[PDB]
A paper describes a structure:
While GlyA from E. coli, one of the best‐studied examples, catalyzes reversible conversion between serine and glycine and thereby affords mTHF as the major source of C1 unit in cells, the newly identified PbzB involved in the benzobactin biosynthesis catalyzes production of 2‐hydroxymethylserine using l‐serine, d‐serine, or glycine. PbzB has high sequence similarity with AsmD and FmoH, and contains a conserved PLP‐binding loop in which the lysine residue forms a Schiff base with PLP. PbzB, same as GlyA‐type enzymes, forms homodimers with two active sites shared between the two monomers.
To gain an insight into the substituted residues involved in substrate binding in PbzB, we set out to structurally analyze its apo‐ and substrate‐bound form. While crystals of the apo‐form diffracted to 2.8 Å, we only obtained poorly diffracting anisotropic crystals for PbzB co‐crystallized with l‐serine and mTHF. However, the residues coordinating PLG and mTHF were not visible in the PbzB structure, since they were probably too flexible in the absence of a ligand, and therefore, we modeled PbzB using Alphafold. The simulated structural model had a confidence of over 95 % and an RMSD of 0.97 and 0.84 for the crystal structures of apo‐PbzB and GlyA from E. coli, respectively. An in‐depth analysis of the active sites revealed that all residues involved in substrate binding within GlyA and PbzB are superimposable. Even Y55 and Y65 in GlyA are superimposable with T68 and H78 in PbzB, but these alterations might enlarge the binding pocket of PbzB. While Y55 and Y65 in GlyA perfectly coordinate PLG, T68 and H78 in PbzB open the space for the binding of PLS. Particularly, the substitution of Y55 by T68 may lead to a reduction of negative charges in the binding pocket and thus enable coordination of serine bound to PLP. However, the PbzB T68Y H78Y mutant did not catalyze formation of any detectable amount of serine or 2‐hydroxymethylserine, suggesting that T68 and H78 residues are crucial to maintaining the function of PbzB. Therefore, one could assume that benzobactin‐producing bacteria remodel an enzyme from the central amino acid metabolism to deliver a building block for the NRPS biosynthetic pathway.
Residue numbers in the entry:
A (entry chain A): 10 to 67, 81 to 131, 153 to 277, 287 to 448
B (entry chain B): 8 to 68, 79 to 135, 150 to 276, 285 to 328, 330 to 448
């Protein structure tokens, strides 16, 4: 009875055709646009099919979809506990934070204590240690968004276990690599793990609460296991979650994760061969942070690059002398490129186009620039040509 | 590519490769076709609105132009559909919309006469059942003058009669308060002119997009004649403050849902709700069982009799394939959990294109259940062995005779 949705598409085509033009135009736009932004990805069509189930009209099938997602999350991540009802990863974090209430909290950036990065582009774990032994936090939150290196969840847990703290990990940005083993997992390192289904699991907007070896071990104080306390925080997106969790166990997802992982290495190496500095000097994960030219600001780069059809994200660089709104670097993720099945040659072509656009941009201040309209049109056509040579495969 | 082909491949992909899930989702649509639902606000989203929910706009966090185009279509449709001068369509929830408007218009610690009928803000109960099943507007006024709330909220889940939004505005203006209207349960009737509109009477009106408007799980924020008027005590207009001065797949579906309600097929389905309620209210009275003289909306509240308990009534009926909700009556001698009444909504029956003859037969089966079940306790239901088998089969047979039309 998938006829329901197919003939539902037919109702839109006949009666709401205006709306259907915009729906068709976005699919084309997402496919004529080159996307190197780290956490943007196109959700797999199967997951889009489950997101429009008749389970919106809501009952034992609502528990079946829930039980299937819980089982699938536990297999993918090796979780002894799993919770799947979060409508966002932000909610998954706050729900855990609410279950665990005491002023002390250490986080990367309640009485919030903050840590950051070393002046050379790494998490200052020794600062995490010093802050933990001083303020005796309730939990320490680990997990970074723009980091280009493997987060040592084991190190964080060593620090926490000497400061009597709980370790929470947001693996939202590296979830697929953690699931496929390419990135070390925090499932047993962290007491509790949170993740987003959409970013790197190519699924719906939502959240997963997970725990491993500490799931049935007692919370520090409060005479309960981590599984209870988390579960005492009590849908279409359930169906889509289970679809995404299922595809994430397929070998096709393992390949997409290696392509994320391959493209990161060739692109970072190709930036270096053009004397553009990658801050880690290497790429682990799906992200490459490039330190931008002397007069080039990250704000100028992203605005000019989008006008040429490439979307990238400005990011702070180690030793940043500039504002947050106007940076000195940019961040690129190989996520949506893996969905485009870009070979090593294509990744080198993208670095070529990107570095060529920047060499033609004459910065005027820190958020203004000049790019000759003709050169912009020519660059925008090279980008769309690369989009055609490497299309989004599952969208075809 | 096209949205349809992406989705047809998506549906095909979720049958070769993920089949366990496909059976569960396909099982549920069958369950809803054999279950006769008399619940007030449960409905089945239209397939046209459902297909819009598989937009690739989900992948959007200018790349925001098409999301702006979808949004503007929803704003303009919402404004025309309800006759509103301001609209906001980005609410994940009806509750999210209500919370968002409350935060925008109330300062921390402000008092709201929510008339909720069941820390940052203080809430006055507002009751509203005192007038023997009517809203106690006179207490709303008394409390409003005594507590001077910044906000008064109107809109009832289980009311079976028209809410006098104008009367609340009279109360609100006398007590120097803002009026919020939650019309989630009567949205289509206000839409189609059957229930009086709150757009100009209330400063801000909110609505779910699923309960009566047959659309996605979500919320909508509205304002009418008070849109360009500044919030009392503040230097900004209601429209700017309500603008809070990213799920776009739901926003495409809201546009589709708002468009369909403008079509006359929605109007007929609204008349079918209003019509079926009158027939079923009439049959209940002629079988000597309705709070209020008649239904002026989609809800019928029935007082169970002869020590019938709303909890056992609802429990027994599900075993016979009929889904209803227990609901308090004026003069609840029993607990809140064990009511002495039953609540029925005709939204699901309009989607089954049931004739007046069929509505009476459903009441017939319903009363025939209650005339037979023998409450032994206030919760332990009894007297349903093989009689419940033929009764379930008879309900499923009415489901067969009257199918959900738009679900083919």
């Amino acid at each position: 009875q998938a006829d329901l949705l197919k003939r539902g598409l037919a109702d839109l085509q006949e009666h709401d055709a205006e709306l259907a033009r915009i729906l068709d135009a976005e699919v084309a736009r997402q496919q004529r646009t080159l996307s190197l932004v780290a956490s943007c990805c196109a959700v797999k069509p199967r997951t889009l099919a489950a997101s429009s189930s008749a389970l919106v009209n809501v009952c034992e099938n609502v528990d079946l979809v829930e039980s299937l997602a819980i089982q699938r999350a536990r297999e993918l991540f090796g979780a002894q506990y799993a919770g799947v009802q979060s409508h966002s990863a932000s909610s998954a974090n706050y729900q855990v934070l609410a279950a665990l209430l005491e002023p002390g909290d250490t986080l990367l950036g309640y009485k919030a204590i903050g840590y950051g990065t070393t002046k050379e582009g790494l998490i200052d774990y020794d600062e995490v240690r010093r802050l933990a032994l001083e303020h005796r936090p309730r939990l320490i939150i680990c997990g970074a968004t723009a980091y280009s290196r493997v987060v040592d969840f084991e190190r964080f847990r060593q620090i926490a276990d000497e400061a009597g703290a709980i370790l929470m990990a947001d693996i939202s940005h590296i979830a697929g690599l953690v699931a496929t083993g390419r990135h070390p997992s925090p499932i047993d390192a962290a007491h509790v793990t949170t993740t987003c289904t959409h970013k790197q699991l190519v699924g719906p907007r939502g959240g997963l609460i997970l725990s491993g070896r500490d799931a049935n071990e007692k919370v520090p104080g409060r005479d309960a296991t981590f599984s209870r306390v988390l579960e005492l925080a009590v849908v279409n997106m359930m169906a889509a979650k289970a679809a995404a969790l299922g595809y994430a166990m397929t070998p096709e997802f393992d390949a997409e994760m290696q392509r994320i992982r391959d493209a990161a290495d060739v692109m970072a190496s190709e930036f270096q061969a053009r004397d553009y500095e990658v801050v880690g000097g290497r790429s682990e994960n799906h992200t490459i942070l490039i330190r931008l030219r002397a007069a080039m600001t990250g704000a100028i780069a992203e605005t000019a690059l989008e006008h040429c059809g490439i979307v990238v994200n400005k990011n702070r660089v180690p030793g940043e002398t500039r504002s947050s709104f106007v940076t000195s670097g940019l961040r690129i993720g190989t996520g949506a490129l893996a969905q485009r099945h870009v070979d090593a040659q294509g990744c080198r072509q993208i670095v070529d186009l990107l570095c060529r656009i920047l060499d033609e941009v004459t910065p005027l201040g820190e958020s203004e620039f000049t790019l000759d309209p003709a050169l912009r049109k020519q660059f925008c056509a090279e980008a769309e040509a690369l989009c055609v040579k490497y299309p989004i495969a599952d969208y075809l």
